[PDB]
Amino acid sequence: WKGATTTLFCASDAKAYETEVHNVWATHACVPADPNPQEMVLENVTENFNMWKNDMVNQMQEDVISLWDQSLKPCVKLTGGSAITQACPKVTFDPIPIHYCTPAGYAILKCNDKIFNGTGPCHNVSTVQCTHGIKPVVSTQLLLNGSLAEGEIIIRSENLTNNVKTIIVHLNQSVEIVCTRPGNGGDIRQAHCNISEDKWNETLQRVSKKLAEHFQNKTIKFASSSGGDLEVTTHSFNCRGEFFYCNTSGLFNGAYTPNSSSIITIPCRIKQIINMWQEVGRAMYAPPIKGNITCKSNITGLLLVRDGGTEPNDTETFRPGGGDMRNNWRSELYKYKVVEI
Amino acid sequence: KKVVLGKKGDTVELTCTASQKKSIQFHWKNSNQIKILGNQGSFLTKGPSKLNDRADSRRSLWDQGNFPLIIKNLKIEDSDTYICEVEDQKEEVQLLVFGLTANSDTHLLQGQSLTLTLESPPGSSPSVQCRSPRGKNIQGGKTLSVSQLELQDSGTWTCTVLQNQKKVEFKIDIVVL
C-alpha cells in the first residue's frame, strides 16, 4: 500500500421515513451502516500520519456543508453581496453519527496508540473499512459529543510554537453541559447553560497540567475569547434548529490548580441573524419555536488559541477558539488515513 | 520598505495579498508578535491587542486572496510594524500615526500666543510646517508656535507633516476676531 486520495462513501443508521434533516440527508447520501465492521490489526507495521493534511477532513467538510445548505433554509441569505429570500420553515435537527468509508482498491488505516498526537509514526496500526460513527456537530470553542481520548488528555496542534494555530484539546472524561431556552421565557431569545462547577474546574486543572508540559516555566491561565465575530466569541452551536450563542467568560477565568453553587451558569442568546460558517456571508432565520428548547451535550473536546507574543512576561494564556470546522472534523479524523492498496 | 501614514481619528486600510489564490487562513500581527486579527474559516477573529475594537477586515475580498487590516479611528499608539502572515508569506507594513492639535483654547485674541502640538510616535522624527491664512509658514520641531497673534492670524491654518516623503495634512481653524 501507499498513501492516497480517493472518493469516500458515507454510512449511517439513518431511518428513511424520518423527517429529521441529518437522517434525510444521510439516507440518500450514504450506505446503511454495516452491522459487522471488519477491523484487522496489522502486525509488524508502523505508519506515519498527519491529521493536519488529511483529505478525509476535506470531504467531511464538503458533506456537512451540503447537508446544511439542503436542510437549514434561512429566510434571507447574503453571499456575493447577492441577497435572496426563500421559504424558511422550522425543521427537525439533531445530528446522527456518520461513518467514512473506503471503496475497493482502497483501505483506511487507523492508529491505535493511546499516546498518538496526530503526527509522527504510529505503532499499533489496524485497517478498517469505515471510521467509527462521527456526529457532525457544528460549534466553536467547545467540541460537543465527540469521542473521548482513552489514555490521558491529549494536546493537538499543527505547531504549538505558532500562536495562530488552533490547539485541539482531546478530553478523556466528558463534562456535561445543558443549555436551554425556557418556555416562558420572557425574552424569547434569552437562554442559559449549566455546567458542574467542580467537573469543569477539574477539567481545566488537568488541561493546564498538560499545557504546562509543552510550555515549561510558565504559569498557565485561561481567559475569555478575545473578540471577532459573535459565533467565535461565544460558544455557538445549533440546537433543535436554533442558533445559540453562549458566553463563556465564566468558564475561562483565571488559573486552575489541583486543589455560586455546584453549578456554573452561562448566559446564552438565540439569534436569527448569523454569520455563516460554510462560507463568507450572512443568514437570517425565523424567531425561535415554542416550548423549552434544550440541548444536553457532552463536552469532549476544546478548541484553544494561545496569546503568545514577544513579551518578557512568561505566563501562557489560552482562550477559546474555533470557527474553522475542519478542526472539528480533525478532532475525530486524526487517527485515519486513506491508503491505496 | 513600505510605510503608511495616518492622521489621528482617521481610518486606514493596510493591504495584504495571497499568491493570487483563494480564501485561506491569514493573520495580522504587530511587531510584538501580539495577534491583531485573522480568520477562522468564514469568521473573523481578533487577538488580545490594544487595537481590538477598531480593527476590522474586508471579508468579501477574502475569496480573492485580499486580507486587509482596517484600523478605524487611528490612535497615535497604533504606530507599529504590522505583519500579515498568509501561506508561507510574511508581508510587513509600518504604520505611523500623527495628530496636530491647537493646545490653546478655541477662541483667542489680541496678542496671545498660538501654539500647535504634533502628537507623534517614538519611531518618528518628522518635519513640521504650518501655513497661516496669510500664507506665512513656520517650520518647527514637535511644538511650533507664533510669537504674538494678530487679527488676520485667524482662519484656516494648513499644516503639512513630512515623513518618508510621503506627507499628511492637518487643516486647523483658529479664531481671533
Residue numbers in the entry:
A (entry chain A): 45 to 124, 198 to 301, 323 to 397, 409 to 490
B (entry chain C): 1 to 177
Paper text:
Initially synthesized as a heavily glycosylated gp160 precursor, the human immunodeficiency virus type I (HIV-1) envelope glycoprotein (Env) is cleaved enzymatically by cellular proteases before binding to the cell surface as two non-covalently associated subunits: gp120 and gp41. Gp120 is the receptor binding subunit2 that interacts subsequently with the primary receptor CD4 and a co-receptor (either CCR5 or CXCR4) and undergoes a series of entry-related conformational changes. In addition to its critical role in the life cycle of HIV-1, Env is also the sole target on the surface of HIV-1 virions for antibody-mediated neutralization.
To define precisely the conformational change of HIV-1 CRF07_BC gp120 induced only by the engagement of soluble CD4, ruling out an influence of co-receptor mimics, we solved the crystal structure of the HIV-1 gp120 core with an extended stem of variable loop 3 (V3)1920, which is designated as coreV3e, in complex with the N-terminal two domains (D1D2) of CD4921 (hereafter referred to as CD4D1D2). The complex structure was solved at 2.47 Å. CD4 D1 is bound into a pocket formed at the nexus of three gp120 domains, in which Phe43 plays a critical role in the interaction between gp120 and CD49. A second binding interface between HIV-1 gp120 and CD4, comprising residues T90, N234-linked N-acetylglucosamine (NAG), H240, and E269 from gp120; and residues T81, E92, P122, and S125 from CD4, was identified. Specifically, within the interface, the side chain of gp120 T90 forms double hydrogen bonds with the carboxylate group of CD4 E92. Additionally, the side chain of H240 makes a hydrogen bond with the hydroxyl group of T81, and the Oε2 atom of E269 forms a hydrogen bond with the side chain of S125. This second interface buries a surface area of 471 Å2, which is much smaller than the 940 Å2 in the primary gp120-CD4 interface. Residual mutagenesis on this interface was harmful to Env-mediated cell-cell fusion and pseudotyped HIV-1 infection, indicating that this interface is important for HIV-1 fusion and entry.
